[PDB]
Amino acid sequence: SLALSLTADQMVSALLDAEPPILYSEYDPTRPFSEASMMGLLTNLADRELVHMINWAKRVPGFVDLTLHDQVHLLECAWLEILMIGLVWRSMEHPVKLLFAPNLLLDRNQGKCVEGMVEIFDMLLATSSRFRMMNLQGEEFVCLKSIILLNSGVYTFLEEKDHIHRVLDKITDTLIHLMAKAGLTLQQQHQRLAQLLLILSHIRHMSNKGMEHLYSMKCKNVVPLYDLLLEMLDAHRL
């Protein structure tokens, strides 16, 4: 297989074809929403999305090359981060709104419905606008997400780390490639490459906060018994 062998275009296509669908929120509860009401929704969504992410992860070049224990870990650290970059990417053309699902577009105010939820919302929205402010192309979007999957749990786990780095390098040449073809200069390319990666820093930060927030909702009992999503949350205490 080896992803370090396929060419840039083969990498981007591999990542686009691997993309997961845009699932739907449960229909009917329309609006408005009680803290319980809204939380059951986002977790039910996240829960069904996890199943698609797990299967997406395997389609990412070089991932299935890692040992099971390592694939399990990587997804345990980045699952929320990855869910968030998707939401942010889907919200792109929805200034002031966060498109959790086509049938579930939320604006800042509704974030006030769930305690301590609004704060996160502002961060997500700021990143959404940041991506639009930057005209993030989908080709770049798929790279960034693949990078998160590999770079989040890599220093928490030596030949395994080595692979992850060899791959992350290919995703960076490929990312640079995408910018080169868009006519950007060298300076603008490494300039843009830095801008995109620096955002992965807030995506980590927002994830940490959300992770701590989700955990807080479990202690209140507003979070349904979503086993897959629970295990994921649990990987951050164990």
């Binding site: 797990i54 399990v72 295990e231 649990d234 990987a235």
Partner: peptide
């Protein structure tokens, strides 16, 4: 922790 494990193997 099995759910995540099982799903990663369906191969």
């Amino acid at each position: 922790h099995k759910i995540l494990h099982r799903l990663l193997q369906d191969s």
